[PDB]
Amino acid sequence: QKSQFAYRSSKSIGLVNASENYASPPKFEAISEPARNACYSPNGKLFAYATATQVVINDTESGAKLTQLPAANTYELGFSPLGKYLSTWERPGKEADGTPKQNMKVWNTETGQLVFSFVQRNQTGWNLQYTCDESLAARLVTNEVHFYETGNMSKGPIAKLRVEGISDFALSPGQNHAVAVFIPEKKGAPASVRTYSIPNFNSPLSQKTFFKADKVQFKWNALGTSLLVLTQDKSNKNYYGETTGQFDLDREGPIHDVCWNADSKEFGIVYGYMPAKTAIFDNRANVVSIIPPAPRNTLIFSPNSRYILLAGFGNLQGSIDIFDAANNMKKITTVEAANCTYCEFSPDSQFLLTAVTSPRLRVDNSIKIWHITGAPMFYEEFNELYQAFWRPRPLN
């Protein structure tokens, strides 16, 4: 329909229908206060932006304001998978008497009701995780993991997890709800990774342990069946879990990016000291494609799982290449976006957005939308641009 994206600069904030000669939906206008943050719901039906005083939820079709949240001093925002809940991280603190304040609260989007409120100090892993049906939520306590019913989480944890000494965890986005958890290294014991079905707390699905591991990184695919695991000062190594006791490098050095494919059939890796080589796999850990060493640090799959992007960010001279899984890994396009700090396919995988953002860069902030062929369709100069992103659509 309309190729809509959002933008927020130091000067303004708005939604832009690229199919409409780049105009905003008629019923849209921001708050008195300057915006400090913004985001879309996973299905792109809603838009939220944060100002000092309040938080406003709009309709991405009309731009019409829908909901008002009395959330002040916010820094982070997050939509639940079906956008029926929105979480707001504030900066932590203590109450008049001395009580720690409820930094992050959960809100309803069609009633504007404060359903819940937690105390937290971290910004990393702040939000609740959710199932895809948005029926279950998950919080992280020392040496425990809590589960909730999203409909009625006020009553408390409907379920808890047995295992002890949990450092981080990650839910499954499959049809049937599953969990993946991690235990940091202690004395006389290595780190460990665990998977559980939510029905089965009693019966683990995987129980693996890992050494010289203080940290970890989980990467489920769209189908909650397979799961990548990454051990990460002196060394880094990459593992694989497939739920079920399943385990499955050509260049010595760091892995720069790890990414699944939208169809959950393939995945790729940007690894080793530069120029970084790139390898595409299958759901089995077998190579499909070997992209030769190039100055790249970032890999992205197109939503339609047809195109593969390979770029270099975090520095100047940032080019972009686009490869085609269907055409024998042909390259069809090479563009450059120097100092690009953000890049993303349009929902229909036909266009490509690039941007340069502050404070990751205080010079040359801009927006540029590209065809999949290489032909630009838009460009806009900013002084201090903060974010710019597509309005996500499902199964277009």
Residue numbers in the entry: 3 to 234, 238 to 248, 256 to 260, 265 to 412
From the paper:
The eukaryotic translation initiation factor 2A (eIF2A) was identified as a factor that stimulates the binding of methionylated initiator tRNA (Met-tRNAiMet) to the 40S ribosomal subunit, but its physiological role remains poorly defined. Recently, eIF2A was shown to be involved in unconventional translation initiation from CUG codons and in viral protein synthesis under stress conditions where eIF2 is inactivated. Based on these findings, eIF2A might be a tRNA-loading factor in unconventional translation initiation events, such as non-AUG translation initiation, and an alternative factor of eIF2 when the active eIF2 is limited, due to the stress response by eIF2 kinases. eIF2A is predicted to contain two to four WD-repeats at the N-terminus and a coiled-coil at the C-terminus, but this prediction has not been structurally confirmed.
Since the C-terminal region of eIF2A is predicted to be highly disordered, we prepared a C-terminally truncated eIF2A (residues 1–424). We determined the crystal structure of the C-terminally truncated eIF2A at 2.5 Å resolution. The final model consists of residues 3–234, 242–248, and 256–412. The crystal structure of the truncated eIF2A revealed that it adopts a nine-bladed β-propeller fold, with the same overall topology as the regular β-propeller proteins, involving circularly arranged repeats of a four-stranded antiparallel β-sheet motif. There are two molecules of eIF2A-WD in the asymmetric unit, and no significant structural differences exist between them (the root-mean-square deviation is 0.98 Å for 391 Cα atoms), except for blade 6. The electron density of blade 6 is not well-defined, as compared to the other blades, due to either the crystal packing or the flexible nature of this blade (data not shown). However, the central channel of eIF2A-WD has an inverted structure, with the wider opening at the top and the narrower opening at the bottom. Furthermore, the opening at the bottom face is constricted by the inward twists of the AB loops in eIF2A-WD. A phylogenetic analysis revealed that the surface residues on the top face of eIF2A-WD, including these loops, are highly conserved, in contrast to the abundance of non-conserved residues on the bottom face. Especially, the residues at the top faces of blades 6–9 showed strong conservation. This highly conserved top face is positively charged, and the most positively-charged regions are the grooves between blades 3–4 and between blades 6–7.
